[PDB]
């Protein structure tokens, strides 16, 4: 049951936009809402509006009086001397709650005229006509206007609606909540050479009487929220999908072949999401818009998605096809379960984020294989256990503070830190995988189909929300639908992993009792760390003995420590028979390293990742080597690679080398075995016999049979030896001699890989392989032996580093004339120059990176150069570079770059709270408090980034470096 | 508490079965007055009265075991009760040799495997008589 927090119900909204002026960056328009009051004596009506100048408001064609105030413009007063962050977080939460449409509130308060009170008490319709104007928007609509001359379509100027969550208040007045569903009528009067893309279906396109402008009329009969309404106006090249004909793809001019190749896969994503769920795609059209200077890499609205143009690749670009493919896939998953089925509160957001991430993981499983699915699930689980042990924990479904261990309030999406938002979505889809583990996948897809079917029977009624609230899901409704389809309720699993905000830590060690033939496990939990919680459920453990692989369920109550499980025979060591594996197959194992008295070959605690856990198991090194070689699970091979770094014995070198030589191993395991072999080789110097590690293996796999030092000409058509070939010198460059310097046998090998590179014969580009070659050249740089702080000049350069510097100079200059796909070699060469500057080789001068961080460059070059400037101002304690970065945060045209500068200055801070630094003035505290209070008031993501930066630099209490 | 329901099969003469079938498929409570069942304290004898006409009944044991299976979707079936008795209307006499379906006829005689070495109760009575006695004399005998 859904009861509105608003005293009115909104039925229909007309959004008309005229006069989109690109020179002056200005729009004019009106908005006409059709509300039905649910309570009599409505009097004031409270709507949401930011940055719009409200000209006039007429209610039922009668002139009404409005008052506007935004408390989130300046959160705390300018003349308050408070400088602690808990004060700002409480004031910011109160300010966002005072404009919240999820309460009754709002920023624009319109007073109902007196003569309509007899129209409002007996509950009859009210039609509110606001007309507004955005004079030069700092948020919401982003105007990308290039400085080439010509007409606005000839130079490539466009507008798009940017922002996250409820940010539609930034470009027209609305009820900007996900729970106020209404039908829509959208008119946009644009230039005759431009096209206006929006939500709904385009009913017509009429000309103006001078035929210089045309009006696009859109209609949206599926009741969506105001937060799902978008806009993209530009000189877009239109491409109808040749497979599905209601799907149109819009790109920027001159990028039509890239659009043709890139969006050619999307019909398979549509077919997948419509056959695992049994509902068809709910909207009547689908539109993909590719734009410049995007807010996020992929945004999903109702019947529309806005991607950045940096996803567009051609047919000869690999290492970008899977990333763009999965961006399209998660946009479509959010089309199904973020835009059609919406949110009932700010709680129950974990339901939608979990269903979107879970069905996108099912797509990844079918498309890229079960092994890529397991690797992705393991990397997401490692991400969340790192974040939750780092700071507190992520609390899905809080109850309204519920989480007081962290420096922001979790009551609203616009007060969350961006890393918390990312980990929120990550934990939501892993908890949905856990619900699939308890209640099987076919019942899970039946739950999702029941939600979609209730929403689509709801979506066709005309009753104003008598039935339109069946399109809003809640937690209680989701659990009730689960209990309807399965008969089991998941309330212990919901109580543990949703309502409780923690992950578990397992420390395991075994001992084999030879007398009674049992395996005595010893599993203890660390439940006193700040991020942890105590697990009391069951726990699966998989033991591989000589007779095969056996699963055991252990009951781990609070007082439990020793778990005795039984062991089988050892009669497959009496005769040589094959040892049967986890799957149905069996292999020949070399049992010379195994103990004579124990049959068990390896043990895995929680193999299926059925809890949110971090396992620290103490096996013997031969058990880790057997688990690396003969396991049929990629997460166990990865964890054995990760645990073999502590055992540098030559049997582990043989194990990793046999993994590296082995095709029919998953390629991301061999790419990890490269770096593990490099670390082991560095640890057993003065024992290593022959050549450096992986060199003979590289010449055996990727070089000519007649010439060992000449590499084969590039043929990248295998896509697994391409990735292994481009990752093996990067790990090989981490080799070090007894003198702690990279050997001149590996550096010469990398330089010969660079010289003899011929790419005139493959059908794929070479930009990522050459960029990884520059990364391998950067890995070999050891710190220089400066004497008496000698100035680093050209004559006293290292003889090794002069070759590296010549190569990166040649590569960067050749990129200036023949550019790569996304300037990958510019990014790699800037990263390598920063590596050479971090050691004492090149003079520590930020002027090159400051010239590459200007506005007109590509955004990857910009963020690489700004990363180099952030690293410089951390190491050299530069005041003027920090003022340069803070000025670039305040006034840069691209808001993604501002968010990225705040992000990089949070990750690599110039000082922490423990450090005494020269950059701990009252002036810097006043600048960052002014940046939290004012200055970042237009983005909701810059303000949370400024809160994160103030927390990283000065902590939760009063800045110490202050009177 | 819950008590398992006790279902049995009622077999009627064919004309009376047709009248009872028509009255059941009609569905009125008129059938309730028309059809009554009186079970005698023997336990294996009764009257079924169809339209107030008395018929003589015997509750017999069926050779196979039937099970009623209900369903909501006609794909998954849930067992509701076990049927082993039939009140045919018109000890060894209370045992039915045939099964309800056409292929199962003379099942007890032909399609049932018989393994052999009331009798136990008789042995218990004999033991009780021996206990109430004073002197017991026994001999395995021959023809006499």
């Amino acid at each position: 049951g859904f009861e509105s927090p608003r005293p009115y119900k909104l039925t229909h909204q007309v959004v008309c936009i005229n006069n989109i002026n690109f020179q002056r960056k200005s729009v004019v328009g009106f908005v006409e809402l059709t509300i039905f009051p649910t309570v009599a004596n409505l009097n004031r009506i409270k709507l949401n509006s930011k940055q719009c100048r409200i000209y006039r408001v007429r209610i039922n064609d009668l002139e009404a009086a409005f008052i506007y105030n935004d408390p989130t413009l300046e959160v705390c007063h300018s003349e308050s001397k408070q400088r602690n962050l808990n004060y700002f977080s409480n004031a910011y939460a109160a300010a966002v709650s005072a404009v919240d449409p999820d309460a009754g509130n709002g920023e624009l308060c319109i007073k109902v005229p007196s003569e309509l009170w007899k129209h409002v008490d007996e509950l009859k319709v009210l039609k509110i006509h606001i007309n507004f104007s955005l004079d030069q928007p700092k948020g919401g609509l982003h105007f990308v206007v290039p400085s080439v001359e010509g007409s606005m379509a000839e130079r490539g100027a466009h507008v798009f609606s940017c922002g996250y969550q409820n940010s539609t208040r930034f470009w027209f007045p609305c009820v900007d909540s996900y729970s106020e569903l209404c039908t829509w009528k959208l008119e946009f009067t644009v230039d005759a050479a431009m096209v206006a893309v929006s939500n709904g279906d385009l009913v017509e396109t009429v000309y103006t009487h001078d035929m210089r402008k045309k009006t696009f009329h859109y209609m949206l009969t599926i009741p969506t929220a105001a937060s799902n309404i978008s806009l993209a106006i530009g000189p877009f090249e239109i491409l109808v999908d040749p497979y599905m004909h209601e799907v149109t793809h819009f790109c920027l001019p001159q990028l039509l072949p890239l659009l043709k190749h890139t969006t050619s896969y999307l019909h398979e994503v549509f077919e997948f999401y419509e056959e695992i769920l049994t509902c068809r795609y709910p909207y009547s059209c689908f539109k993909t818009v590719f734009i410049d200077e995007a807010y996020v890499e992929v945004a999903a609205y109702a019947s529309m998605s806005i991607f950045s143009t940096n996803l567009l690749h051609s047919a000869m670009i690999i290492d970008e096809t899977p990333l763009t493919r999965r961006c399209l896939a998660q946009s479509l998953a959010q089309q199904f379960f973020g835009c059609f089925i919406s949110r009932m509160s700010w709680s129950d957001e974990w339901v939608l984020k979990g269903i979107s991430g879970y069905i996108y993981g099912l797509w990844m499983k079918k498309t890229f294989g079960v092994n890529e699915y397991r690797h992705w699930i393991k990397e997401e689980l490692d991400k969340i256990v790192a974040y939750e042990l780092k700071t507190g924990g992520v609390l899905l479904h809080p109850i309204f503070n519920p989480a007081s261990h962290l420096h922001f309030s979790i009551k609203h999406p616009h007060t969350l830190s961006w890393e918390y938002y990312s980990m929120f979505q990550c934990k939501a889809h892993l908890v949905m995988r856990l619900i699939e583990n308890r209640i099987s996948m076919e019942f899970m897809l039946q739950v999702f189909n029941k939600l979609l079917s209730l929403a689509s029977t709801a979506s066709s009624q005309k009753f104003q929300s008598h039935m339109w609230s069946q399109m809003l899901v809640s937690t209680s409704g989701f659990l009730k639908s689960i209990s309807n389809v399965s008969g089991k309720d998941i309330q212990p699993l919901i109580k543990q992993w949703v309502d409780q905000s923690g992950v578990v830590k397992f420390y395991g060690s075994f001992a084999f009792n030879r007398k009674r033939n049992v395996l005595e496990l010893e599993i203890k939990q660390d439940y006193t760390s700040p991020g942890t919680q105590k697990y009391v459920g069951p726990l699966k453990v998989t033991v591989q003995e000589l007779d095969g692989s056996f699963n055991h369920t252990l009951q781990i109550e609070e007082n439990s420590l020793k778990h005795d499980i039984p062991c089988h025979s050892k009669s497959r060591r009496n005769k040589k028979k094959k040892i049967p594996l986890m799957n149905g197959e069996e292999v020949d194992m070399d049992l010379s390293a195994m103990d004579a008295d124990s049959p068990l070959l390896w043990i895995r605690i929680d193999p299926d990742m059925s809890v949110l856990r971090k396992v620290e198991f103490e096996q013997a090194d031969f058990m880790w080597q057997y688990q690396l070689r003969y396991e049929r699970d990629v997460v166990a091979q990865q964890e054995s690679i990760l645990a073999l770094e502590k055992f540098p014995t030559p049997a582990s070198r043989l194990a990793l080398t046999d993994i590296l030589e082995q095709e029919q191993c998953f390629y991301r395991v061999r790419m990890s075995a490269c770096f593990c072999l490099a670390k082991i080789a560095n640890s057993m110097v003065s024992t290593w016999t022959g050549p450096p590690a992986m060199k003979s293996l590289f010449t055996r796999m990727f070089c000519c049979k007649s010439c060992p030092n000449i590499v084969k000409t590039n043929n990248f058509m295998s896509f697994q030896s391409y990735f292994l070939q481009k990752t093996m010198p990067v790990a090989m460059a981490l080799l070090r001699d007894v003198h702690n310097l990279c050997p001149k046998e590996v550096l010469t090998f990398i330089l010969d890989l660079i010289k003899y590179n011929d790419n005139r014969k493959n059908k794929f580009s070479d930009n990522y392989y050459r960029a990884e070659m520059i990364d391998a050249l950067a890995n070999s740089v050891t710190p220089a032996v400066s004497v008496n702080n000698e100035v680093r000049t050209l004559d006293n350069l290292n003889p090794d580093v002069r070759l590296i510097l010549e190569e990166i100079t040649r590569f960067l200059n050749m990129e200036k004339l023949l550019p790569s796909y996304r300037h990958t070699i510019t990014v790699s060469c800037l990263r390598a120059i920063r590596v050479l500057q971090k050691n004492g080789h090149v003079p520590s001068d930020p002027a090159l990176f400051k010239s590459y961080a200007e506005y007109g460059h590509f955004v990857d070059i910009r963020i690489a150069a700004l990363e180099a400037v952030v690293d410089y101002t951390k190491v050299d304690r530069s005041y003027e570079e920090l003022q340069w970065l803070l000025n670039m945060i305040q006034n840069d045209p691209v808001p993604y770059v501002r968010h990225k500068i705040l992000n990089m200055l949070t990750k690599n801070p110039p000082f922490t709270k423990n450090m005494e630094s020269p950059l701990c003035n009252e002036a810097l505290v006043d600048q960052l408090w002014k940046l939290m209070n004012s200055g970042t008031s237009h983005d909701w993501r810059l303000r949370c980034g400024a809160v994160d930066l103030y927390f990283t630099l000065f902590g939760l209490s009063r800045p110490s470096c202050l009177p | 508490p819950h008590e398992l329901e006790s279902q049995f099969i009622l077999r009627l003469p064919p004309e009376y079965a047709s009248t009872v079938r028509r009255a059941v498929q009609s569905g009125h409570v008129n059938l309730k007055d028309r059809l009554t069942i009186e079970l005698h304290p023997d336990g294996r004898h009764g009257i079924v009265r169809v339209d107030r006409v008395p018929l003589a009944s015997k509750l017999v044991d069926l050779p196979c075991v039937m099970e009623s299976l209900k369903t909501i979707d006609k794909k998954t079936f849930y067992k509701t009760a076990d049927i082993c008795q039939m009140l045919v209307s018109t000890e060894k006499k209370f045992i039915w040799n045939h099964g309800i379906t056409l292929p199962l006829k003379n099942v007890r005689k032909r399609r049932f495997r018989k393994t052999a070495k009331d009798v136990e109760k008789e042995v218990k009575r004999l033991l009780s008589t021996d206990a109430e006695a004073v002197s017991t004399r026994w001999e395995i005998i021959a023809e006499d």
């Binding site: 029941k450 029977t457 | 849930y78």
Partner: protein, 376 residues
């Protein structure tokens, strides 16, 4: 840009009972069966009531239930369409398992005493195995009940002919070929309860052939047998502790002695030793209170302790124990632990079975005998 997961080298290649059945509730799954109740196993006699409307001697009107059937079916369809229209789970209460509603079919068994048999409240599925004709085939002959599946590899011992559809009961316990027959024209179904008689007609009756067992019945005094007895007693003790309303949860010993009267009280005290303690004096006197450090297991853990199919295998074992005991080596071969072990071993390919023998439940040439023969 492609799959790139070497999946062919790492990975080279359902029955939901009612909530009374998975919770092992005591009318449907009895704790103890005596000798006269083991002789009447799956053949329950018509009991005389002591109190109720049918306990008074005299004529009793039967009551038609066709408004009840269609009202309950319309109500369940409203529940299903209110829940999104998909397939729903309805059997959540014991009162859902009555014969007074839903579409009843009957299922007759060919064997006298099968090796495995379902208790009341358990679910089974009807699968229509259809082998296509060589080359072109019209499609499975359609059938009123069950779902159709195309079986290249015959589930049963024989192999299906081309173009032959065979229906079968499929569950976790067995798999057995069923054959739809129409009901006799004279037989109706009388459901008697304490309140009165109720009458349904039946139209569909299946004949169930020789079962192919999928669960192994344990032997007497086996390790699996004693493990099931101990786990069943532990589950009953946990569910008595859950039912206790006292704030320190407390039970009485003679409730357990009423449920399991053949058990020596040393075994019951062994189960209560961990998780409970006896209070002799003061408050809670002569009660077994729950220990304060002991976490009583949740509902899903208690369900994971004992499965209903294990209870059916145990009931088959003790019923066969009684029948063998009453009848004073051929009979021992026909015991369900031997025949279930023989059939499951034959399905893995361990050994072969003499298909003509003495374990033949027909007693003639029809039907199989599941006793092990060597493959040499």
């Amino acid at each position: 840009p492609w799959n790139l997961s070497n999946d062919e080298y790492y990975y080279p290649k359902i029955i939901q009972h009612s909530i009374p059945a998975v919770e092992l509730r005591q009318p449907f799954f009895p704790t103890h069966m005596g000798p006269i109740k083991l002789r009447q196993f799956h053949r329950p006699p018509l009991k005389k009531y002591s109190f109720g409307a049918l306990s008074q001697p005299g004529p009793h009107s039967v009551q038609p239930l066709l408004k009840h059937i269609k009202k309950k079916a319309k109500m369940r369809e409203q529940e299903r369409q209110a829940s999104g229209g998909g397939e729903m789970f309805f059997m959540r209460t014991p009162q859902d398992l009555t014969g007074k509603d839903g579409d009843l079919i009957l299922a007759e068994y060919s064997e006298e005493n099968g090796p495995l048999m379902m208790q009341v409240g358990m679910a089974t599925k009807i699968k229509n195995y259809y082998k296509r004709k060589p080359g072109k085939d019209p499609g499975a002959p359609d059938c009123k009940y069950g779902e159709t599946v195309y079986c290249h590899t015959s589930p049963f011992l024989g192999s299906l002919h081309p173009g032959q559809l065979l229906q079968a009961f499929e569950n976790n316990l067995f798999r057995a070929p069923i054959y739809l027959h129409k009901m006799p024209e004279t037989d109706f179904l009388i459901i008697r309860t304490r309140q009165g008689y109720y009458i349904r007609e039946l139209v569909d009756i299946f004949v169930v052939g020789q079962q192919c067992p999928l669960f192994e019945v344990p032997g007497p005094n086996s390790k699996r047998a004693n493990t099931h007895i101990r786990d069943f007693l532990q589950v009953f003790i946990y569910r008595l502790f859950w039912k206790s309303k006292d704030r320190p949860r407390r039970i009485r010993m003679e409730d357990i002695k009423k449920a399991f009267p053949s058990h020596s009280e040393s075994s019951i005290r062994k189960r209560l030793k961990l998780c409970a303690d006896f209070k002799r004096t003061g408050m809670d006197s002569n009660w077994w209170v729950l220990k304060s450090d002991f976490r009583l297991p949740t509902e899903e853990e208690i369900r994971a302790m004992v499965s209903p199919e294990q209870c059916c295998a145990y009931y088959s074992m003790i019923a066969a124990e009684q029948r063998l005991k009453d009848a004073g080596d051929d009979e021992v071969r026909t015991a369900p632990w031997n025949t279930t072990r023989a059939f499951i071993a034959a399905m893995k390919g361990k050994c072969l079975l003499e298909v003509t023998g003495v374990a033949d439940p027909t007693g003639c040439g029809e039907g199989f005998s599941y006793v092990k023969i060597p493959n040499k």
